[PDB]
Amino acid sequence: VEKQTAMRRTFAIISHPDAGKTTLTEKLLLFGGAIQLAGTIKSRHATSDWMELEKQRGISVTTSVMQFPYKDYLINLLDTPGHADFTEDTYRTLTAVDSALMVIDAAKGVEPRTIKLMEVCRLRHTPIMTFINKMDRDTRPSIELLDEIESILRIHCAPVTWPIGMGKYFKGIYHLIEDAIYLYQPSERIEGINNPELDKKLGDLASELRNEIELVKGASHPFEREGYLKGELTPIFFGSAINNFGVGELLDAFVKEAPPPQGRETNSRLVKPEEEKFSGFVFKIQANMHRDRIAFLRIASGQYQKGMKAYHVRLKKEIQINNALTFMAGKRENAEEAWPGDIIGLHNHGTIQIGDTFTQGERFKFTGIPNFASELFRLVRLKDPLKQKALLKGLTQLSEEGATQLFRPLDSNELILGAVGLLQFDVVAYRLENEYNVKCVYESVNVVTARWVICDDKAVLERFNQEQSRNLAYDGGGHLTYLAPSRVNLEITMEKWPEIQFSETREH
Amino acid sequence: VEKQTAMRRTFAIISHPDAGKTTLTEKLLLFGGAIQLAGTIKSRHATSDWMELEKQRGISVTTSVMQFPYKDYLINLLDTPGHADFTEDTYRTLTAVDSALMVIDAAKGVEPRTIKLMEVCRLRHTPIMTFINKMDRDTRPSIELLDEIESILRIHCAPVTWPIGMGKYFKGIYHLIEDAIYLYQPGKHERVGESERIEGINNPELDKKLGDLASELRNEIELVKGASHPFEREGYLKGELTPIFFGSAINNFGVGELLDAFVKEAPPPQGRETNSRLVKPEEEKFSGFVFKIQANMDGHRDRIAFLRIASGQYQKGMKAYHVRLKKEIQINNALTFMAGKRENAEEAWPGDIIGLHNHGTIQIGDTFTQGERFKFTGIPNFASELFRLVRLKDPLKQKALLKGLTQLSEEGATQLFRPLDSNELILGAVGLLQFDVVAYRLENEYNVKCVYESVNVVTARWVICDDKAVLERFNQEQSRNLAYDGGGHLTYLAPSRVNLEITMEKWPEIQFSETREH
Amino acid sequence: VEKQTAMRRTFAIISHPDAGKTTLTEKLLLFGGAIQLAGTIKHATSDWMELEKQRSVTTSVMQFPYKDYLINLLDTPGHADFTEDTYRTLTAVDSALMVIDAAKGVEPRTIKLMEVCRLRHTPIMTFINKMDRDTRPSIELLDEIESILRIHCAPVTWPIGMGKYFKGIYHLIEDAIYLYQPGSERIEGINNPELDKKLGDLASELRNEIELVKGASHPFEREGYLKGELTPIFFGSAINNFGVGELLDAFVKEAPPPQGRETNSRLVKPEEEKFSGFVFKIQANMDPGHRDRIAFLRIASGQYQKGMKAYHVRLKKEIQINNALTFMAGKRENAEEAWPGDIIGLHNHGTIQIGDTFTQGERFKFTGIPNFASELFRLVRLKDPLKQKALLKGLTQLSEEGATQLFRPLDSNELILGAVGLLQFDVVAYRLENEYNVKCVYESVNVVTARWVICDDKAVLERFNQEQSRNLAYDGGGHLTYLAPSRVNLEITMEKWPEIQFSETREH
Amino acid sequence: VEKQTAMRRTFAIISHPDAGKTTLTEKLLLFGGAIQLAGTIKSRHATSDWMELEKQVTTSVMQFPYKDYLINLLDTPGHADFTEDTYRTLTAVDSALMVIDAAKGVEPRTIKLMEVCRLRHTPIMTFINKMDRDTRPSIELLDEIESILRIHCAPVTWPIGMGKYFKGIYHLIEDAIYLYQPSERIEGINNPELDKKLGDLASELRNEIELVKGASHPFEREGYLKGELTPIFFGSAINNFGVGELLDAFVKEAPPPQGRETNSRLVKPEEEKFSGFVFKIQANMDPGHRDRIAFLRIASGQYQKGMKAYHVRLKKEIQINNALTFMAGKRENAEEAWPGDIIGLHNHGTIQIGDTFTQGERFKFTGIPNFASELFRLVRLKDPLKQKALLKGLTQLSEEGATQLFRPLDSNELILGAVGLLQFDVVAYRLENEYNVKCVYESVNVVTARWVICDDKAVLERFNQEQSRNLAYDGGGHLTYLAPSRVNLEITMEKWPEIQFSETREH
Ligand SMILES: [Ca+2]
Ligand SMILES: [Ca+2]
Ligand SMILES: [Ca+2]
Ligand SMILES: [Ca+2]
Structure with a gap:
């Protein structure tokens, strides 16, 4: 029961509309083998438009949470709608993550929603990893992008990858930790920033990379687990999501460094996920556009088992969760079980409210x-x-x-x-x-x-x-x-x- | 001379990219019967792509300034490139206008360039007229758009027109001074005179046509009247107050209302300070200053130095005094900017811009007179x-x-x-x-x-x-x-x-x- | 019973005289703690005869522990005491370690002993010795091995400089540099800037040579090594005990445990419960009037137990093995037991001949x-x-x-x-x-x-x-x-x- | 992956020669739809003859669909081509179907094949065949099975008459009568309609069914799966009568692919990683040729045409590109296979009896x-x-x-x-x-x-x-x-x- 929580990674992408969230989400899904969801999401409005589809079809219920395997990890990506279906739930969903992935449009830098979503993440000092997107087109200087993040968003930047050129002359990225160059060829790999072959293929860009890398390590910070976990430092990655480039490096650093489900405070004590008893909290409700509704519950401890009995703390009442919605990509049926970090959908008709805590008898309410x-x-x-x-x-x-x-x-x-x-x-x-x-x-x-x-x-x-x-x-x-x-x-x-x-x- | 000056309106549009400046420019041009030109600017990029195009055609300098008549006015619109061709020149062009027209994407509100270009304008307290674009799509709430302007851009908002509905249910605009409603009816805003106009905000006909939008209008206008300022020329001319217009540039709606208020209220060419005396446009002697230089990309090594006329009259072939070089020069064939022109004009007046040909003897800030030595400041x-x-x-x-x-x-x-x-x-x-x-x-x-x-x-x-x-x-x-x-x-x-x-x-x-x- | 087989490594050193077998052997014993034995290890047959009469069998086999392994090193005399036994001994090993004089390359005995090993496609690990003196070019040495010895070379360590400017070795699998500082400084990364500071131009030549090696050589692959088609190459200086550790660690890790052997009918596996073995060498007492002989037997299966009954297949009768010679370094007396892969010395007076198969009753004869x-x-x-x-x-x-x-x-x-x-x-x-x-x-x-x-x-x-x-x-x-x-x-x-x-x- | 195992039924028919194995196999193939295959085995020597033909394989295993079920039938040659392979095959099934000649009862081969099944406590279901001819008494047949084959009998069907007056069968569980007419169904053993059609046979049925109540056992699942109890069916394979009832009970009760112990641990079918073991090797007889087929039962994971497998004994990675599959009506070898299935491994003498295959984990199946x-x-x-x-x-x-x-x-x-x-x-x-x-x-x-x-x-x-x-x-x-x-x-x-x-x- 320890490895079920250990392998899990629950997060969300924070970004200003048009930064690349959807595009990146697709690619990460492809890495997870979720060819099904991948195409589906790209197949995507005024508010009115959203309501039309919503009523007739309204299949926005099965993709509010995207769960998929990668290596020996289980990744829970919670949706953060930013367009027509932007609501307060978009903010509240961040309370159910353990870390966040920030996407910035390299040509734009920090934007209004980038700031808002960071403020929300800041409520729990949520760890942040950054993907600087759209290197294939002209961008602001990388140093400028980093400086702005530090000043405006109040967090130290720690480059892990770095762009080679920009726009038309974007030739790849340099992994500072591996000391390797991944060439952008719409994926040849070259070891050593000083490798003479770099100068042969990249010319003046080779010495510009060296120049910039030196400036970086003098005016910037190196990646650091502790600072990252306390939300004081963000590792930066550069790429082109639409070309599925730089994404792999981002994902590998994510599963490796991003936190597993953490414990949450309550009005009485700290609940840790490794506790054998089940517990969770409701952070989002969406009704059927009928009179039935789905309350999204993040599991905070123990395990969920289909057909189990749980305790609805507010209503001082025992309940049975018979067929809670789960979110494994490509699944045909709801999972028979679920674990801390995961999200499950509780069907009801108005008896479940935001903040509702569920346990197995113990009476506490989750805070925050x-x-x-x-x-x-x-x-x-x-x-x-x-x-x-x-x-x-x-x-x-x-x-x-x-x-x-x-x-x-x-x-x-x-x-x-x-x-x-x-x-x-x-x-x-x-x-x-x-x-x-x-x-x-x-x-x-x-x-x-x-x-x-x-x-x-x-x-x-x-x-x-x-x-x-x-x-x-x-x-x-x-x-x-x-x-x-x-x-x-x-x-x-x-x-x-x-x-x-x-x-x-x-x-x- | 004083009459030449009185009919001129020199301005620029300030806006964040994608807000609708090119679209509004097209529509203003059409109001000025510059049909050919409107078509060209409409048929419009990494910096490298721009460089290529510039090398090939090299006629981005003849549309850097767009001059066109409207009624008994002559309008000078100086461009402010915001995309690939954004440069310091974009800021400095604002020193050459007497007022500005700010365009805002209603779904976006105030953006980074909006703020920056307002800062430049603030340097001279340049008067600002505001146009809230893209009403045909869902927008941020009107009252909210105005508050962000007052709060972020530090200028009082004075609604002159106001939207009825938005996006799919945008049905027109109310004109607070005329007390009249212009209905939005696609297909009737191609040529002037075909659009429907309704007198009186309490006119029963409104409830008939627009239903619940009519009472919402009545409610919003009362909110505006209570929390906003009425248009006032003095505050406007001081750059402390901006009249707001709402519309849909792409559908040529609300543009006529904007343009009419502009020619009526926007200031004619104004006096310019120097290291000594103040120069007034009505003065008989010619003078002006260079505010940007564009190089011919095409074995060419000539450049065009853009000069704003501050006073007097330019005459083709005239003698002039290059104050920095303490020398007399001749101006034989300066570029002019009348839309649809066959050749450069024989003369230009205060508020006008002209393009001085040279091979490096003319620089930014250069003052030209007819003998008097002074340098324009600012x-x-x-x-x-x-x-x-x-x-x-x-x-x-x-x-x-x-x-x-x-x-x-x-x-x-x-x-x-x-x-x-x-x-x-x-x-x-x-x-x-x-x-x-x-x-x-x-x-x-x-x-x-x-x-x-x-x-x-x-x-x-x-x-x-x-x-x-x-x-x-x-x-x-x-x-x-x-x-x-x-x-x-x-x-x-x-x-x-x-x-x-x-x-x-x-x-x-x-x-x-x-x-x-x- | 199985554990005992898994931990054993039985091998021999193959080499032309003066290549450094005795020296390398000394260093290997030191790693295993056989301090005393290493000391003893370190003319004409006329002289060898004399020393043998005056006073060998106790050191024909050298058994010593290293970490969690037990190593059996069978001697292959190449000087005055070279005989057919030197060849036949190789039939009792599961793999071989070839030592080459970097100054000499492939020599006559190198060829013969490889030919003998090839009989059973014996896996070969290679140590290029004497880097502290001028050598033949490294690429040349490997080509001579591939061309003359008909086996692919797979560099695992590589030399840095040679002779006077020998600075150490590069481990291709660890990507780490070991500095030869004759009085074990380790530098991580072949592109690490500390290398150029300490080794100057030798660093660039190293990176060049590694590129050449990558292109025209093979990476280590165990299936091929185990098949006898590929030999991992190590470089060093045995007299300075340099590069020996890398070899040894790769040896115990990659070299095979005792393997099954064929007989005139069935295949015999080491893990079988029944004891069995074969005689591959015989040495007689040079004492006048004495008829003493020691028959060297490799254990093919089961367990040797002191005082056990065994079946002498050729003589089709039962015998007793009371005090078989064992070969643990620093031992005082003969071990009470031994396992597959081990050699024991059977005391007799002429009833045991080369090829003699011993079992616990079953009638078969080992082949090869x-x-x-x-x-x-x-x-x-x-x-x-x-x-x-x-x-x-x-x-x-x-x-x-x-x-x-x-x-x-x-x-x-x-x-x-x-x-x-x-x-x-x-x-x-x-x-x-x-x-x-x-x-x-x-x-x-x-x-x-x-x-x-x-x-x-x-x-x-x-x-x-x-x-x-x-x-x-x-x-x-x-x-x-x-x-x-x-x-x-x-x-x-x-x-x-x-x-x-x-x-x-x-x-x- | 879970339903893949749960939908499969792998078994073999155990019987003495001439009992009715060939005939029943045909009928089973029919219910499945494999008309062609069924029509083939019907076209059925001394060892000498067999060796002749075998010079001038794909029916050693017979895989075929039935409802939500996939049936793997491993053959157990009893005539000219009887060999040890016949016994060893049973190690590859999860249960077995016993066919008895009603006029003969338990015969020598019956006993041997039961002993083999006993090695793994293989669940047994029974079919008493040839009711259309005179028979040994039914209680006598049951008794013989009990004492000689050391397994309790649990009738699910029961004969009505015999020889000349075989009129149908009774289904103790359903309490229904299926009439034999060279398929009318009647409910209630005490149904007055029996007496009207069958006559005194109706009372004889009631009598015998009562006799079965006190001296025999009721079908008990746990007992059957433990190998302590076998459900008894009666009929006439030549007339395809009583066959349907046997098949239905089979696909329902017969166990899905079970796990298999090894030298290291118990391997479960549900495991992700592919594993299997060879239980039989068939050599190509054609002169000059040197190719063989190693029949392998899949114990876990899945087979994928072109996968990388680990040859445990040889400590060697191998590639399985075109393993023989045994789906009736197949045009080509299947692209995949699941536990309980058998696939044929092509080779030239590098695969041996007992050989385990995995994907890297080195262990060896037992038994x-x-x-x-x-x-x-x-x-x-x-x-x-x-x-x-x-x-x-x-x-x-x-x-x-x-x-x-x-x-x-x-x-x-x-x-x-x-x-x-x-x-x-x-x-x-x-x-x-x-x-x-x-x-x-x-x-x-x-x-x-x-x-x-x-x-x-x-x-x-x-x-x-x-x-x-x-x-x-x-x-x-x-x-x-x-x-x-x-x-x-x-x-x-x-x-x-x-x-x-x-x-x-x-x-
Ligand atoms: Ca309530
Ligand atoms: Ca100059
Ligand atoms: Ca003899
Ligand atoms: Ca063999």
Whole structure:
């Protein structure tokens, strides 16, 4: 039962849209023998478009988690949708990984989502490996790309591979550890950075490689396990994903260095995966676009066995998991068992919520499962006023399943919806109609961001509430929330109240 | 003369690549009856690909500036290449405009180049009109787009038009000043006059045509009225406020509204400061300044120096005074830029750009008058964003390399740095293409083959300090990271962002600038 | 019982005299801790006889431990005590270690001993000795081995410089450099910059030569080594104990454990529970009046146990083995047991002959135990024909004990002795006198070489005999033998009679 | 990979000649669909005749589909081509089907093949054949099977009448009657419809079924799989009657490919890595040729046409490019194979009986047996100069299971031991064709053989001294008693009760 966890590697790719996530995912799948999934994923929208396919077909349930073997390792790749189906779940999914793979477009460097996803990873000091993609086209200087990562993303860079040329004159990569050159020939290998054959085939590029490698080892850091595991250092790899080049070097360093499933804290103790008793937590729910839903559970300890009895901690109730969805690529049936690090899909009809902890009787709740500051806001109401209670009931449940956040402004009876991605508004409106027979209408509001408000000094907090009530609300969890009409307003308010904490995350 | 000036509008579009500048340019050209030209720019790349194309056709300089009539106005649009042909010239072109038109991809909002080009504009408080493009596709929420502009770009937003719907349900725009709705109806925006217009935001006809979009509009406009500013000419002319327009350039929608407000509100040619007096465009005597130089790639060794007319009148074949060379020259056949022209014009006016032919006697920042000696100020260098050591395979060609690099620097082709503690030569560029142009020029004009090497430099700042005791002290601790540029200005070459910060905090009495007067 | 076989390594050193066998042997004993033995190890046959009379058998076999292995090194005397026993000893090994003088290359005995090993396709490991002095070019040495010895060379270590500028060796499999610093500094990586700092130009020449070797040579592959088609090459200086360790570690790792042997019927495997073995060498006591002899037996299967009953197949009766000579270094007395691969010395007085098979009852005879073409020939007669009977009785016995070969021409009445080594004549002369009170005299004969004649076609053979009987003889075992007056005569006869097989060896 | 093993049923038919094996095989092939193959075996000598034809293989194994099942039927030649290979084959099956001639009951071959099956406690199912002719009483047949074949009988079908008045069979489990009409089904043994059609036979059925209740056993799975109990079926193979019921119970109850012990550990079929073992070798008789086929049972992993295999005994990597497959109706050899299947390994004398194959892991499967020789002949040459060749030939022949070889302690003579008379012909021919030696046979005073085992070296040495005239070592170096008579073996075994005289030994 020790080797089942030992061989496992659970992770996700963080990247700004168009960096190369999908392209890389395909290649890694090819290395895993998953020729099936590989083609399927590349065979891939407005939010509306996603909903159309979603209803009729909606086979986005079988690829939210991609499990595949490589060497003597089992790799769990969790999906982080970034386009039409970007939602808060994209952030929350990172809570269920043990490390992350960051993809950067060499021509772009660090982008807005790169920063956001890193901030999320930063919540658990999640180890990061970096693939600098698209070397086959012109790029920013490699040193510049690295420097920016260190300054903006606040993490030391440690090159493991390095580009030879760029764009039209991209001739391959140099593995700093192997001291070998892999030639890019749309894979001849050459040992020794000083090997005279390099100068013969690559010319001036050969001495440029030597030049750059020297600059690197003077202004940069060498790879280091400890720093990497503490999230203070990231090994960098350069390649061209579309040409499946540099990927193999990345994957080998990944399985070798990336962490196996780690333990997680609870409201009582540290749970380690090697414990014989089963346990896990729910971090994502998606409903059938029917009334059944699938709650994605990361196993935290013990083992899962089909048809087993488990303890639903919140509901103080024993349950039986009869046919939990598993994610082995190419499988025909659900696996009979699963292990720590793995994800399983729990079928239900509304009895499972975000953060739900499952055990075998022991009553604890896993911590660290976050809500994230909403980025998009809308007022929600009905045309038929006689349906208010069902609207609230629906929104509450939806809030509990992480589909949306819900805000009740102090000075009114209005309801405000908070979303991280545009699709959530579509999913809410549909689910409300289908599951609650409630027809809702959206309106624009003057809110652009949100912060949770925290002050242990109740006299200060009370003066704050009195003054800022127009911009205050309670969310679905009862937490005081500041809904800023503008970034500038947020700045002024925060500056006006240095005694009050304004947070971008909170525990669900 | 004063009438010639009054009808002119000289501007450039500022935007991040892919935002829609080329598309908007096409549509503006069509409004100006420049059908042929619109077609050409529309039929538009690694830096190497650009180099090839340039060598083959070499007519990227005749469209560097696009002049076209609209109503009783004459419009001068200076291009700001943002793709393969991005270079320092892209920043410096902004010194030659009287206002700017910012284009934003509504699905993207404010991007890195948007920010950078706004910084350049800020140097002169250049007035900004804003166009939010791509409404025909899903966008970020309108109110959010505006907040990011005010927050990131430090300028008040003043909606003049406003979107009705978005993406698949984008149905038109409301004009806040006209109180009128222009319906978006593909197939009716090819020729002017065929589109449907509705009077009044509370007009019942709206609810008929657009349904729930009508009440959403009414709601959003009230939010905007309460949290936004109304358009105000003074704030606009001061560069503190930007009127916002929304549309879909590819479908020629919302463009007419933008163009009409532009010609109405955008400033005509303005006075330009000098080392002494202020020069006003209405003055009788001709004068101007050179703000960029483009070399003929095709055994040619002629170049075009782009000059903005600051006052008076250019006449083909006129005598003029080259202030730097303290010499009289003749201007026999300067390039002009009227769309669809058969030949260069006989005259040009303030706000206009003309192209002066020369073989290296004209440099960036050069002032030309009719006798008066003064130099226009405010023509900037901008901090280089790319760095490379340059050297030779043959030591015997050092003199030619230096001569070439010195001329190229003086023509703005590149920046040139000489570290204090070495004899090495470092080239500084804003755009990747500059290194290609420099290498080609060195070979073709100076018969010198240069070799580039990466160097440990990511950014640079010009160093200024009143107290010379502190400064000279500073030149001791940091000489290894110091250099003199081609103008003899002390420059700090930061190996990293962190190093710059750390050096700057240690020396707060020392100013570190990202721009300097050329 | 199986473990005991797996840990054993039985081998012999094959080499031309003065190549460095004694020196390398000394160093190998040192690695095994046989300090004393290494010391003892370190003219004419007349002198060797004297030392043998005055005072060998205890060191004919050298057994010593090394790590978790037990090594049996069988001696192959090449100086004054060289005899046919030197050849026949190789039939009792499972592999061989060839030592070559880097200054000499392939020499006459190198060729003969390889020919003997080739009989059983004996696996060969090669040590190129004397790197501390000038040598023949390394590429030359290997080509001579491949061309002359008909075996592929697979470099495993490679020399750095030579003679005065000998700096050490490169291990191709470890990619590590061992510095020869005569007072064991190891440098990792052939492209490691520390190499150029310490070895200067020799580093680049090394990398050049390794490239040449890669291209025109073979990498080690054990199937080929074990088949006798490929020999791993090691370089060093035995006198300086340099490069010996690498060889030894590869030896115990790659060299085969005791293997099964064929018999006149079934194949016999070492792991079988029953004891069995064969006699490959015999040595008599040179003491006047004594009849003591030691029959060297290799154990083919089962376990030797002191005082055991064994079956003497030729004599078809049961005997007892009370105090068999054993060969552990530094031993005090003969071991109480021994296992497959080991040699033991059977005490007797003439009842044990070359080829004798011993079992625990089963009736079979091991095959492949060879006679080798004699290289020296002499007529043997008496001054006084009085004891002619005793002479013939002695020569017969000596021939059966491998001390000499005996030929009796088809057409005449002379007795002709054949020897591989000069010493044999001295031992025969001395043994006849001391054991058969016969004084023999030798006479030169016009014979330079011998070949056993084989032909299944009686008519052809009779035709052959009618023309060549003058050159034909029966040997001691009744085998037809051609005695050539000259090399040319043999070539002419062989070319005239291609239907007839002329062999340089036969089954004893 | 899991269902691959679970869908396979590998067995063999055990019976005395003339019982009905050939006929039942045909019927089984029919249910499967292999009409052609079935029609072939129907076209069915002395050893002399067989040797003739065999000069001028693919039906040694008969693989065929039935529902969700794949059936591997290993043949067990009982007539002219009966040899030791016939016994050794059974080591390659996971269960067996016993066919008995109703008029005869348990016959000599029946007993021998059951003894072989017993070596592995091989599950047995039984088919009492030829109900259409007069028979021994059914209770008598069951009784004989019990005491003689030491296995409890568990009827699943039962005959109604016999000879002239065979009217059908009764299915004790289903409680249904299938009528024999040269296939009407009736339910309830006490169904009044039986009496109407069959008459007094209806009461006789009820009577006998009740008799079976108290004196016989009910089919018990665990017991059957343990080899302690065999389900009994009745019918007439010539009329394809009662056959269907046997097949269905077979595919349902018969065990899937089981694991096999080795010198190192128990190897399971489910294992990823490919492994197998040779239990039979067939030589091409055609003159000049030197090719053989080594039949290999797959114990684990999977066979892939063109895979790399590890020849354990030779410590050598080999390549299996075109291994013979035995799917009925096949156009070419199969690209893959799974545990329980048999494939043919082409070679020229480098593969031997007992040979294990893996993918690098060096171990050797166990339980592959040698069986006591039943026929004996002295072998010699008229040309004494070929003694070496004879021995080399005979040794090789011995390792390929073509014969056993014995060397008596008190002479230099060579005795061959065979199970089937054909082996002598095959050996004489092979010695000639492959070793160019002409052997001569002479009768010997030996009728049977037992392997001598005894851990008491004190007793063993005296035994050897006293009985040396009847002792020899075989081709594996095992001490063997060669009895001049049955009575001699009985006495000898009584005078030495501390010595084990076995009829089998691991090869
Ligand atoms: Ca609930
Ligand atoms: Ca100049
Ligand atoms: Ca004798
Ligand atoms: Ca063999």
